[PDB]
């Protein structure tokens, strides 16, 4: 009988406090890069203001999908220390010569005496992609913070923990992870702030800009080191589960058959459903919930005493959905808090598409609530975007990472990566052609309002299949390696 | 720090044209959405018209059909086109941004406004 401190066994609290660290220092990582790059590739010494476009629309996804082809062939060829060290340490290592030589050094590197003579070469219509060449370094820096929000957040901490965590452990510390991930959001922005601050506080004759991104970048180094040891640490002195053995299977190391494989997968197709389900709702009834919103405050002065308020609520929606995500997955399970998020969804945004699209009708039934139609509008959509928002790392990310739990390593590993790299920005380029085509065709995003409603229904509407089927397929995973676990122990 | 410079106001006839342009700098103004609020003396500031980063032009419905928001990546900058000009369209025109991030202190940036006078 080991000894338990809080109600916990000490090998399962040693197994998840240095988890919750890593995910606090990766989305702390996360938040200063977030901000850095973006503050960063503006204020350039010649920089586009169609550079930072270019990257989310022709270099996020076509870089994303060849992360996921080179992240295949490395777990093929690697083993799992191997593969977490080769994806995490490149990035320490760039973000620390960024902030310490390429950052100081960039007159030097940026071929700004190159591309001028090619942009009197090639035409203004090119003015894309000479920009990122004159800024390369700083363009690599905002590519490579966009990949750890994507990689060393979602594949390689969730990879380890789902390698490591069983399927009741996961219930147990997957939301108490979402908090932590919240305090190292809070932490990170109040330490972006200092920096920001203090980028002016300092006196003249000084680049405070250059301070202010060594230290950023020295307090992400950090934390990434501190990463790297709690990933050795966790790796030699905690007994992880070895599996099992069924684990042995053909190592694929086709790039066309592993992923012909996943496409052919029924697991990865609801799984991936589902992300790509979550990404486009948001997106869309956002886009829609803030139209709705300006039209309600004309005045800038409620208009940002409302943009107050809702974040007060967002905080305490946050906080206590990270209680009730606790408490319904040691009750209710994985299929429950699954199917909670797409179904408020689905009721939300059933009743705001309804006080928009019929205002009218509607008007009567909320006078009884002092409101305008279009108040009740603004405010149904901001609690969907409120449940949306804080049910990411207390309902929906625990649900998607303990999906990945009871698969087989091969499977487990592949599709992580292809979901959580690939398919995720294909919600979001998925949404915004769905709202541009809605565009084209009926010339606005408000002529085309019961479109968008009943494509937002279809869509929520295969997020709630794909989460039944998923539930099904989950708990028939887990049925049957416990069962052959326990035969072959037997 | 954040710059926010409006251009393009001036005295027009009733049933006129006249392009407003918001240059802005300190931020990226294509990632976050742009405002156009006016202010008429004796009267409270009112929005106008909005840009999202997609560029998805949400117009208020005094001037929805007359108006139009269009943000230039190109060259930086916001533009808003006024066909059909009305005497109550007379006023200062400020270009907004909030909500930068924790890169910014305040949440609320405004240009010093352009005065747009629409004469009967």
């Known amino acids: 009988a080991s000894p338990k401190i809080f109600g916990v066994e000490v090998a399962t609290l040693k197994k998840i406090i240095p988890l919750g660290l890593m995910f606090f220092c990766i989305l702390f990582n996360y938040t200063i890069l977030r901000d850095t790059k973006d503050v960063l590739v503006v204020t350039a010494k010649g920089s586009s203001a169609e550079i930072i476009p270019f990257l989310k629309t022709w270099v996020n996804l076509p870089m994303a999908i060849g992360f996921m082809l080179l992240y295949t062939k490395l777990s093929n060829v690697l083993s799992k220390k191997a593969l977490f060290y080769t994806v995490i340490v490149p990035f320490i290592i760039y973000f620390g010569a960024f902030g310490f030589v390429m950052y100081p050094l960039s007159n030097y590197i940026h071929p700004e005496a190159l591309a001028d003579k090619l942009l009197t070469t090639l035409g203004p219509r090119f003015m894309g992609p000479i920009a990122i060449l004159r800024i390369w370094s700083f363009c690599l820096f905002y590519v490579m913070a966009e990949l750890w929000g994507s990689v060393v957040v979602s594949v390689l901490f969730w990879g380890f923990a789902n390698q490591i965590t069983t399927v009741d452990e996961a219930k147990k510390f997957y939301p108490l992870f979402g908090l932590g991930a919240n305090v190292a959001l809070i932490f990170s922005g109040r330490t972006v702030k200092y920096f920001s601050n203090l980028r002016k506080n300092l006196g003249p004759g000084v680049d405070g800009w250059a301070v202010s991104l060594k230290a950023m970048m020295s307090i992400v180094v950090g934390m990434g080191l501190a990463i790297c040891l709690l990933y050795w640490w966790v790796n030699r002195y905690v007994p992880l589960p070895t599996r099992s053995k069924n684990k042995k299977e053909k190592p694929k190391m086709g790039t066309m058959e592993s992923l012909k494989f996943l496409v052919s997968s029924p697991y990865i197709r609801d799984l991936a459903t589902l992300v790509v389900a979550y990404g486009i709702s948001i997106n869309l009834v956002e886009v829609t919930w803030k139209s709705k919103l300006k039209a309600q405050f004309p005045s800038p002065n409620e208009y940002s005493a409302f943009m107050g308020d809702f974040s007060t609520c967002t905080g305490v929606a946050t906080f206590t959905m990270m209680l009730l995500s606790q408490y319904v997955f040691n009750k209710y399970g994985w299929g429950v808090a699954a199917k909670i998020t797409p179904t408020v969804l689905l009721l939300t945004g059933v009743a705001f598409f309804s006080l928009i699209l019929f205002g009218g009708p509607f008007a009567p039934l909320v006078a009884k609530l002092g409101m305008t139609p279009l108040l009740a509008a603004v405010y149904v959509g901001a609690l969907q975007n409120i449940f949306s928002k804080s049910a990411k790392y207390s309902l929906f990310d625990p649900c998607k990472e303990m999906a990945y739990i009871p698969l087989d390593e091969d499977t487990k590993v592949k599709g992580k990566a292809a979901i959580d790299v690939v398919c995720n920005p294909l919600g979001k380029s998925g949404g915004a052609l769905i709202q541009q085509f809605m565009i084209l065709s009926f010339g606005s995003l408000a002529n085309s309002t019961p479109y968008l409603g009943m494509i937002l229904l279809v869509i929520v509407t295969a997020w709630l299949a794909a989460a039944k089927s998923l539930e099904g397929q989950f708990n028939s995973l887990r049925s049957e390696e416990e069962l052959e676990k326990e035969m072959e122990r037997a | 720090e954040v710059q926010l410079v409006e251009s393009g106001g001036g005295l027009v006839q009733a049933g006129g044209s006249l392009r407003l342009s918001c240059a802005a700098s300190g931020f990226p103004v294509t990632e976050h959405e742009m405002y156009w609020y006016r202010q008429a003396p004796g009267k409270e500031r009112e929005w106008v018209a909005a840009?999202?980063?997609?560029?998805?032009?949400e117009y208020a419905d005094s001037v929805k059909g007359r108006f139009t928001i269009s943000r230039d990546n190109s060259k930086n900058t916001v533009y808003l086109q006024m066909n059909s000009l009305k005497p109550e369209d007379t006023a200062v025109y400020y270009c907004?941004?909030?909500?930068?991030?924790?890169?910014?202190?305040?949440?609320?940036?405004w240009g010093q406004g352009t005065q747009v006078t629409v004469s009967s």
């Open positions: 907004n941004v909030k909500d930068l991030g924790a890169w910014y202190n305040d949440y609320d940036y």
């Open positions: 840009i999202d980063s997609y560029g998805y032009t």
